[PDB]
Amino acid sequence: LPHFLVEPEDVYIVKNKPVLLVCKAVPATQIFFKCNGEWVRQVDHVIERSTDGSNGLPTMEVRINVSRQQVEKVFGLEEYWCQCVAWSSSGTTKSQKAYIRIAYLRKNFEQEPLAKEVSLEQGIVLPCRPPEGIPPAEVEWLRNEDLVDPSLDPNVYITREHSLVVRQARLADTANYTCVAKNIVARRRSASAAVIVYVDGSWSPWSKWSACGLDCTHWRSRECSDPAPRNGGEECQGTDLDTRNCCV
Numbered sequence: 001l002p003h004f005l006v007e008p009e010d011v012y013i014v015k016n017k018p019v020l021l022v023c024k025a026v027p028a029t030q031i032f033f034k035c036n037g038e039w040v041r042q043v044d045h046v047i048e049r050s051t052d053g054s055n056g057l058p059t060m061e062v063r064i065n066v067s068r069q070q071v072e073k074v075f076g077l078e079e080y081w082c083q084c085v086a087w088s089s090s091g092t093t094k095s096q097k098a099y100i101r102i103a104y105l106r107k108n109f110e111q112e113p114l115a116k117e118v119s120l121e122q123g124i125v126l127p128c129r130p131p132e133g134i135p136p137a138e139v140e141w142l143r144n145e146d147l148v149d150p151s152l153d154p155n156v157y158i159t160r161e162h163s164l165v166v167r168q169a170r171l172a173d174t175a176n177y178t179c180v181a182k183n184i185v186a187r188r189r190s191a192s193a194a195v196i197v198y199v200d201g202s203w204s205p206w207s208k209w210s211a212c213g214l215d216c217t218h219w220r221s222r223e224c225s226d227p228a229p230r231n232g233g234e235e236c237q238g239t240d241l242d243t244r245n246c247c248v
């Protein structure tokens with residue numbers, strides 16, 4: 001019985017360029033391809049006959065070119081497939097069904113990231129669902145122009161559901177985040193989502209009481225710097241100076 005060395009793999013049509021399906025078996029006397037329940041012509045087959053290194057048995061290597069027009073013309077229930085069959089003195093053998101699909105990628109995203117307002121300690125999740133296409137598109141994130149790398153920082157990482165997760169604000173500051181769907185046919189960039197990191201201003205501890213001056217009054221100082229109000233963040237609610245009656 002013949003044993004396959006090289007089996008036909010699942011190939012995709014990029015643009016309109018032909019695909020090659022390599023098939024090799026040992027021992028082989030005759031080798032033919034069967035596409036969608038129909039045999040391929042002998043002239044279309046590119047045969048390669050050679051003697052095996054391990055034992056004195058004939059080895060055959062065959063390759064067929066399948067164009068874009070050949071795939072799209074076949075209309076039915078199941079997808080375009082090509083199975084390689086090998087012959088010998090003992091019997092026949094069947095290889096794995098290699099599925100040939102026309103590669104594509106849509107323009108409209110299923111889900112795009114939106115603008116979010118977050119504080120210094122709180123964490124945010126930026127969701128993204130890439131457009132439909134065969135094979136599925138890989139997801140890459142951009143912080144403004146620069147590519148987001150999850151290996152550089154543990155606080156910034158991309159989940160299995162393509163969403164970007166950030167747990168802090170100083171480790172990932174203010175930036176327009178855009179989701180990029182990457183496929184062999186086309187690269188699709190989503191709309192930029194403005195992520196703003198605000199610092200809510202809270203008062204600093206009270207200073208020491210000043211000496212009792214004239215008109216029986218003494219003041220105390222206060223500052224809005226623990227933490228200081230940055231970006232959109234709200235200012236400190238209260239007074240900068242506190243007056244109290246204390247003398248002669």
Ligand SMILES: *[C@@H]1O[C@H](CO)[C@@H](O)[C@H](O)[C@H]1NC(C)=O
Pocket residue numbers: 174175176194195196
């Ligand atoms: C996003 O870019 C716009 C200009 O196109 C800018 O005005 C805005 O502040 C940016 N947002 C962030 C978070 O950088």
